[PDB]
Structures are given as structure tokens and as C-alpha cells.
Design a protein around this ligand. Structure first.
Ligand SMILES: [Ca+2]
Ligand SMILES: [Ca+2]
Ligand SMILES: [Ca+2]
Ligand SMILES: [Ca+2]
Ligand SMILES: [Ca+2]
Ligand SMILES: [Ca+2]
Length: 389
């Protein structure tokens, strides 16, 4: 018995047919024409020949990308928050514009952390293909997700740390287990949950506007501090559906010093993030050819239970980027009645979130994009200035 993902002709496919072969429908995607199915191993040739079946992919593994670093009854500002020039922005916005949410697909959250809890707008889990809103399912069993969320969104108060966007609503989408391992099927159901939001229903309404749409509860940002080595059609499809809904996608480069990013970081519609240290040196583990980079060594942030921890990885850089896009779109929307388009890796203008990230980044190492830093270290305050000006 294996779990498999079947891409399909919606108008020629009958889901009950898998049952006649020892099969079970786990989840049917609403936004992509695919089904998550458990079948017998010997039954895979049968499934391929069934009506409406276009492709059968196997279910791969993605992993967490942050680990223990090297390395006060008060609030510390982590260095990395200062590196990306977040504090100065907070008098124009802290991200608490009501139509903006950042989705973080990870290991879950310590949902009642004193320094987090006022920003957890939704706490979900898609572990094992089962979407669960129960609090023992959505709870962080590892620590990692709690850490990445505190980096985007830790409350500005007199305890703990402070996030890049310390007023932003966060959706915590548990797609990784207690060991920070997750499967590609749970992770694509994660992206879809982040596009459907709480009420369960992409658009909603009309319209056909999803992200930045004040009647939707779709996220405007999907954050992935995770990576895998497989390239699967259905996962990249899902990626495309988020991008198409006008959602910015951000993912860790990978921690193997490999010559390129992991998946989904490597897709053209995702922002790959590499990791710098506090001396502006690229992390040695950082996978290359990222889109931008951000702090990712000796990162202090929230951690269960109701506590704090220092980690490193491109998993840590990633949420600094996600915070910066939250501040861009919250600022942009607070001034206009709308959000910027996502844009592309080749954008060098004001008119796109990605082009904004590109042109306002602190350009390190060789002039221009390079394989260590991408376009550079990302700066909230120049970015937002470019957003609004
Ligand atoms: Ca929204
Ligand atoms: Ca705090
Ligand atoms: Ca919705
Ligand atoms: Ca609307
Ligand atoms: Ca707790
Ligand atoms: Ca450069």
C-alpha cells in the first residue's frame, strides 16, 4: 500500500474507480485536477490505465532547513531584524492591515506563545492528507515553525524578540511532522489551504481576485522554510495556482552548498532565499543561485514552550523575506486600495513585489545578481519607500 498523486481529466475521471482496485481517495484538490490516493503497490499499472488518468506521481519527502546555531527579561531585537531595516518601517505600518495574511507551512506553532498569540489568525494542519483545525494537530511538535513565525511576526512588546512585521496575521499550516519531515502531498494541500483560507472557498464571491481582496481570507504570502529534491508536476501546478491568485511565494534555498536551489525554491514563481551571517558573509551551507538573501546564522526567535532559541539555516533567512513582502503589500494597500503584482525573477522595476525586492536589496559581493547573494540582502525600509513613492 503506497500513496500516490494522480493528475486527471476532471470530465472523464470517476474517483470511485480507485476503490474497485483496492484503492482509497485521501484528498481531491479543489484548485488542481489531481487526487491523493492510497493504492496497493502492485496496483499502479491498473491505475495508470483507468479513464481520465493522465499521470501518476509518487509521494516524495521535503525536509526542514533550520538547525541549532553556533551560538534578558525584556525584548531583544534580533540582529537580522535590524539587517533588513524593518524597525524604521513600523511608523508607516507594522503589517496589521486586515486584508494581509502570511501563510507559514512548517511544523506548526506554539499557538499560545505570549510573544506570538495575538497574531495567529488560523491554526491548521494537513498532516497525512487530513485537514485538521484541532489544536493538538496544528500544534508545533518540533520547534522550527514556531521559530520561523517569530521571525515574521513576533509581537513588539517588552518580552522576547520582535518580528519583521510584528502586526501581521499569520496562518500556521502544519505540513511537517515532529521531526521536520513532510511529504509533498501534505505540502500541496498546505498551499491550497493557504489559498482557500479558513472558510474554505478561494473566491469567494466573484471576482476573480483572491490575494489583496478584502472579502477573501486568502493569504497574500505563502512562506516555505523547507526543501526537497523531487520535481513533481502536481506540486508545481499548485505553486502556479498560488502565484496566479496573486500570492507571493518564498522558500529556503537549501542547506547543502549545492550549486542551485531545492524545490520549490527552484521554481520561477517562487523566491529562493539564501542565508547571510552577521558579517554579511554568505552562510557556507547556503545553496547557490538564490533570488535574494537574508539573515540565516545565529537567529534568535521564539521557540516552545513559551521560550526562545537561536537557529541557522536558509529556513531562517526565508521568513525575513516574507516579513518584507508583508510590509510592502500592507503599506501599498494602506495607501492604495490594492496590492502589487508578484512579478518575476527578471523584474527590475517598482511595479512588482519581486522587482521591488530586487532593486532595493543591498548588493553585496560582485555587482549585480551573483550566485551567492542573489540580487542582495533584502531591506524593508527602502523596499516600502519604493512601494509607495
Ligand atoms: Ca488576505
Ligand atoms: Ca516581543
Ligand atoms: Ca477563502
Ligand atoms: Ca471582492
Ligand atoms: Ca506554549
Ligand atoms: Ca552582487
Amino acid at each position: 500500500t503506497i500513496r500516490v498523486i494522480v493528475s486527471v481529466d476532471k470530465a472523464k475521471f470517476n474517483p470511485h474507480e480507485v476503490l474497485g482496485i483496492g484503492g482509497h481517495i485521501v484528498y481531491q484538490f479543489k484548485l488542481i485536477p489531481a487526487v491523493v490516493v492510497d493504492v496497493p503497490a502492485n496496483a499502479v499499472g491498473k491505475l495508470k490505465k483507468m479513464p481520465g488518468v493522465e499521470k501518476v506521481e509518487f509521494d516524495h519527502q521535503a525536509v526542514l532547513l533550520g538547525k541549532p546555531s553556533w551560538l534578558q527579561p525584556a525584548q531583544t531585537i534580533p540582529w537580522g531584524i535590524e539587517r533588513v531595516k524593518a524597525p524604521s518601517v513600523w511608523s508607516i505600518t507594522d503589517g496589521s492591515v486586515s486584508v494581509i495574511q502570511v501563510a507559514v507551512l512548517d511544523t506548526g506553532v506554539d499557538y499560545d506563545h505570549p510573544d506570538l498569540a495575538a497574531n495567529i489568525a488560523w491554526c491548521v494542519s494537513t498532516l497525512r492528507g487530513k485537514v485538521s483545525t484541532k489544536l493538538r494537530d496544528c500544534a508545533d511538535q518540533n520547534g522550527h515553525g514556531t521559530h520561523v513565525i517569530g521571525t515574521i511576526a513576533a509581537l513588539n512588546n517588552d518580552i522576547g524578540v520582535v518580528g519583521v512585521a510584528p502586526g501581521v496575521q499569520i496562518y500556521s499550516v502544519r505540513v511537517l511532522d515532529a521531526r521536520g519531515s513532510g511529504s509533498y502531498s501534505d505540502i500541496a494541500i498546505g498551499i491550497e489551504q493557504a489559498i482557500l483560507g479558513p472558510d474554505g472557498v478561494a473566491d469567494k464571491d466573484g471576482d476573480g481576485i483572491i490575494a489583496g481582496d478584502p472579502d477573501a481570507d486568502a493569504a497574500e504570502v505563502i512562506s516555505m522554510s523547507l526543501g526537497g529534491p523531487a520535481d513533481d508536476s502536481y506540486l508545481y501546478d499548485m505553486i502556479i495556482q498560488a502565484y496566479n491568485a496573486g500570492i507571493v511565494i518564498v522558500a529556503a534555498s537549501g542547506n547543502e552548498g549545492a550549486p542551485s536551489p531545492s524545490y520549490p525554491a527552484a521554481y520561477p514563481e517562487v523566491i529562493a532565499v539564501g542565508a547571510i551571517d552577521s558579517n554579511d558573509n554568505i552562510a557556507s551551507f547556503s545553496n547557490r543561485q538564490p533570488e535574494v538573501s537574508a539573515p540565516g546564522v545565529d537567529i534568535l526567535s521564539t521557540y516552545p514552550d513559551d521560550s526562545y532559541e537561536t537557529l541557522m539555516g536558509t529556513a531562517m533567512a526565508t521568513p525575513h523575506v516574507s516579513g518584507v513582502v508583508a510590509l510592502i503589500q500592507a503599506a501599498y494597500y494602506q495607501k492604495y486600495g490594492k496590492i502589487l503584482p508578484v512579478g518575476t525573477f527578471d523584474d527590475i522595476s517598482k511595479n512588482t513585489v519581486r522587482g521591488i525586492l530586487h532593486i532595493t536589496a543591498d548588493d553585496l559581493g560582485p555587482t549585480g545578481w551573483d550566485a551567492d547573494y542573489g540580487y542582495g540582502v533584502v531591506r524593508a525600509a527602502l523596499a516600502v519607500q519604493a512601494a509607495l513613492g
